[PDB]
Amino acid sequence: MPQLPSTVLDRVFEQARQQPEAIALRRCDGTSALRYRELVAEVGGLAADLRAQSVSRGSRVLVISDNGPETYLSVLACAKLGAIAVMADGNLPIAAIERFCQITDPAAALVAPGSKMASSAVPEALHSIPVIAVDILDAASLAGNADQGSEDPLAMIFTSGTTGEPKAVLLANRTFFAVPDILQKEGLNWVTWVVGETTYSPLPATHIGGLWWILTCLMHGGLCVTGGENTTSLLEILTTNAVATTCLVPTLLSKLVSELKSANATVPSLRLVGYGGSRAIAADVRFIEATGVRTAQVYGLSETGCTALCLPTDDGSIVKIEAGAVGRPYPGVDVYLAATDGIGPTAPGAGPSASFGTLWIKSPANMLGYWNNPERTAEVLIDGWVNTGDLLERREDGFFYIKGRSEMIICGGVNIAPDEVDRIAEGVSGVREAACYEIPDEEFGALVGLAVVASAEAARALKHTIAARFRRESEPMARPSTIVIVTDIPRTQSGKVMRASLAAAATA
Amino acid sequence: KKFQAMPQLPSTVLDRVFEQARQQPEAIALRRCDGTSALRYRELVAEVGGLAADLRAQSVSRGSRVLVISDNGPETYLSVLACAKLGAIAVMADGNLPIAAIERFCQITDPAAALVAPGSKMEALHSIPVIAVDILDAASLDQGSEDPLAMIFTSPKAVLLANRTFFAVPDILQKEGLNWVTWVVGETTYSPLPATHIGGLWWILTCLMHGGLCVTGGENTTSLLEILTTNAVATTCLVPTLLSKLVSELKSANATVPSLRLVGYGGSRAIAADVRFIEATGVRTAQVYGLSETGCTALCLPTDDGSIVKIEAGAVGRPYPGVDVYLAATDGIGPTAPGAGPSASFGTLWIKSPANMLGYWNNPERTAEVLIDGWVNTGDLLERREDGFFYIKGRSSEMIICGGVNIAPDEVDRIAEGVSGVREAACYEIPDEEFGALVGLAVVASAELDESAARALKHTIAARFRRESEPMARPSTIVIVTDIPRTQSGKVMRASLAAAATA
Fold first, then answer.
1. Architecture of the CATH domain B1-396
2. Is residue B341 less than 8 Å (CB to CB) from chain A?
3. Of all helices (H) and strands (E), which one includes residue B410?
4. Kind of pairing, strands B400-402 and B405-407?
5. Which helix (H) or strand (E) is A415 found in, with range?
6. Domain boundary assignment for chain B
7. Does domain A406-508 match CATH 3.30.750.24?
8. Cα distance from B502 to chain A (closest Cα, Å)?
């Protein structure tokens, strides 16, 4: 906490002094590799180019990101000058870029090698400002910017709550280290960083999850692999690089689990997997923990500076994830459920957090505001609390759940017993096992979905067979609205269908 | 009701309009709200002829696509008809759409020319010839029912529409002598719905066929009532939002529309309270249910005794005679599919209608799954009730179930009414993906409150509710209304309120 530097850059430089020979960054295939000492000097080099080009404290620099080492050197060179690193995705069409430039008003632009052709249009489009190609230990080299603080802006991330508009999310230095400090200080192993361990982010540097993870790893002396992926196989990426920790979104975790099923392999080097963003699928998490690996669901938003709640691997955590738990609050991260919209956590007479309502979060990783948008900021951000927009319940177990707890489905006033539907679907020849799940419906409340594993005998015809069996019943609701032929149905070890894990797998 | 309805009548929209010109050449066919861009049936005929020449001069031919950059005015329907004369396909494109969007229409449809209506003055499409459009010879009066007349975008997906799309339903209504929807020769109609939207295009095109005086485009105002009033409009076609605004406009101004005979509406969830307001003014109404894919309305809910209760209940309509409907219990198994069984009383709505689309343009894979043997998958989820109508939801619990907890609407309103400053209150269900339903609360203020003033009422109600034993019961949203809709017993119409409250 207070013993440690209060900027990201300065924590990176500390690590570099402790282990200047360890690799800080490299791409998956091993190119663009920087040691901590080389990173330090490169950061020195690039910021001297930026100072030369008139970039000062408070200046915005557009970072056209390829997710690689050069992307992170670029952020750190901005940090060196007290400049704000605006993260722009290289893939995006120049019209999106120009719009970022309208909002942020950059003084320069830094272009990573993997966006360079797309970047190439930009220099002509961006005539007004110096746009630089980024390619590749005395105390003076390890000096930071003494005037920058924990509160000072380091980065901007674009988010689109609005269907068309993207808001520029303004992020202080503290965003990156506020939660890791909490963990270390309260001694929690929910998320851990081991000195030197290899990590991998398949998440873009322009997404809060990607930026946050690689930054906290740099501070912690990790070897961060990111950028030059030449395959879609995570298992190949993980194995080949002996990755120890990685940050996932559920659909990536699911693709990993399927890649490991399909090969009867594991990733033995792998220690820890964080995942978040979308709905967790207990089944994939469980398959991953069985294979030796510790996990952490990290719930959070760009506006909250990434994770604000956590669900670490522990007894019963899988049952909780399946029931819809998002996790529990880190110490020093206050959580408030507001029962009625328009009435914030600090409203006079509002009262204490309800156990059901919109989650508001007061964390020291919280964003400083939306760039150039006082009107949308004043509503989402108020006296330290960010409105996350999400509806959650707190149970007696202290965990937050994104849904309520009845063992029967309700479709148009009509109670469906899931087990009974499964029984019906399993009396049909060709069916090896079957399992129903709920499909959300605005007007009917819920519908019945049915997942089906066929015996070995194409079976598209079975769907028709099953459909016709349900047809011969006198409850119209009690009939599956969708019937998916699957290879497996997620089950507890005790043998019970994990219906929430199943619904997730069927709608992909 | 099974066979060809009116086979004596021409099988092209164009011919039917020309037929109108023959019978009433001096009657006004089209005009803008301000009275400019005016064409008589006679002049409409004449301009379609010269416009068609222009088109052929740019090598436009049968099957050639023609991009029609619409301003919803007389120049636009004139354009459509000029395409029709060559058997070219009118690709409807909104002329206020940003450049990139027009560009994709062009890449999708690849037209031989472009016709620009003046109400959107403005390369991008240099490569193709653009014609500016700017406003009886009996001999100058073989396209048929099935040839394509127009493309409408799902906006992106391109819906291919035949001529029969525009007369097949009205030929049925005529054939069966039904008055659900009717067109009177020479009556004034108005369409706030654009030519680029199935509703608007189909509406105006039907009126022209029927010898209507069609007022379209060039709105001199934002007031829907001033337009209807000033033009003495007799029939109109609306979406629920616009209907709500007409009602709102009608309440505030203490007016009726005296000329107004018929209002069609659809496109979103209908609001039973607005409909009832309108009909009490003497106006017949028809809910028209349909999509681009179904060539507009396939189901219709006509003003009738018990029609307001059905609409408040969530009814969408009953099919027209000759239009086939089929609820498939399971997705994937269509009507065609083997041993498909007959229609269920609940499931995904499939339609077999003579107005159905020919398919999506250059999309064989998506088309093959949505349209099979004349049947179209609407994608909508419905229940066929005892009374033969189709409904959007299930029979009411009368209880809001939030995360498994039952909540009493009477109990909730009781609480809000007990707060000083509340003259009356009524709650309503807000559907939720994860917790099922939330409680909404509509409040009628006892007294007027400054723009600042009302909110302390929101907090005070919120506070009061905060202090109750059950978390689920509490209103997730509190909205202030000058009006809570009631049945003629005085029970709250909670669905009408839930539509008005949300907006």
1. 3-Layer(aba) Sandwich (3.40)
2. yes
3. helix B409-417
4. antiparallel
5. strand A414-416
6. 1-396, 397-503
7. no
8. 13
B375-384 and B390-391: which strand pairing? antiparallel
State which fold the B397-503 domain adopts. GMP Synthetase; Chain A, domain 3 (3.30.300)
β-strand partners of B319? B299
Cβ neighbourhood burial of B402 (10 Å; 0-12, 13-18, 19+) = buried
Residue pair B288/B265 in contact (Cβ under 8 Å)? The answer is yes
DSSP string over A381-441? EETTEEEEEEEEEE-TTS-EESS----SEEETTEEE-HHHHHHHHHTSTTEEEEEEEEEEE
Structure tokens, A490: 């997620």
> Can you give the C-alpha Rg of chain B in angstroms?
25
Measured distance CA(B185)–CA(B213) in Å, rounded: 8
> Residue type for B314, please?
G
Q: Write the CB contacts of B211 (distance below 8 Å, at least 6 apart in sequence).
A: B20, B23, B24, B27, B41, B183, B185, B186
* Residues whose CB is less than 8 angstroms from the CB of residue B23 and which lie 6 or more positions away in sequence, other chains included: B211
Of A123, A131, A137, the C-alpha closest to A42 is A137
B436 CB within 8 Å of a chain A CB:
yes
CA distance between the termini of chain B: 41
CA A105 distance to own-chain centroid? 28
Q: In Å, what resolution does this model reach?
A: 2.2
B465 touches chain A (CB under 8 A): yes
Min Cα separation B155/chain A (Å): 14
* Cα gap A186→A289, rounded to integer Å: 24
Contacts (Cβ under 8 Å, ≥6 apart) of B139: none
Q: Which of B330, B369, B395 should we substitute to test contact with A (largest number of A Cβ atoms within 10 Å)?
A: B330
Query: Dmax over Cα atoms in chain B, in whole Å?
Result: 82
Q: Is the peptide bond before B124 cis (omega within 30 degrees of 0)?
A: yes
- B100: chain A residues, CB-CB within 8 Å: 95
The answer to whether residues A89 and A122 touch, using CB atoms and an 8 Å cutoff, is no
- Beta-bridged to residue A387, according to DSSP, are A360
CB-CB contact of B80 with B71 (8 Å): no
> Chain B contact for A389, CB < 8 A?
no
Strands (E), A226-364: 245-248, 272-275, 294-301, 306-312, 325-329, 334-338, 356-362
CATH class of domain segment(s) A2-405: alpha beta
Shortest CA gap A138–chain B (Å): 54
Quick one: tokens of B48?
């379609």
Q: What are phi and psi of B270, to 5 degrees?
A: -65, 150
Tell me the C-alpha distance between A108 and A63, whole Å.
9
* CA-based nearest distance B345→chain A, Å: 7
Q: Are B410 and B473 in contact (CB under 8 A)?
A: no
B330 touches chain A (CB under 8 A): yes
> CB of B49 within 8 A of CB of B140?
yes
**Bridge partners (DSSP) listed for residue B438:** B430
A84-89/A60-65 β-pairing: parallel
C-alpha to C-alpha distance for A11 and A221, rounded to whole angstroms? 9
Q: In sequence order, what DSSP letters do the residues of B235-262 get, joined into one string?
A: EEEE-HHHHHHHHHHHHHHT---TT--E
CA dihedral B126, B132, B136, B138 (to 10 degrees): 10
Please classify residue A166 by burial: count the beta carbons closer than 10 Å to its beta carbon, then call 0-12 exposed, 13-18 middle and 19+ buried. Answer: middle
DSSP letter for B492, please. Answer: B
Method: X-ray
Tokens 């990607």 -> residue: A210
For residue B71, give Cα distances in angstroms to B68, B96, B116, B267, B308.
9, 8, 9, 21, 35
Interface test with A, best of B97, B346, B469 (most A CBs within 10 A): B346
Residue B457 token pair:
């009422």
Residue B313: closest C-alpha in chain A: A443
* Token pair in block for residue A250: 């559920």
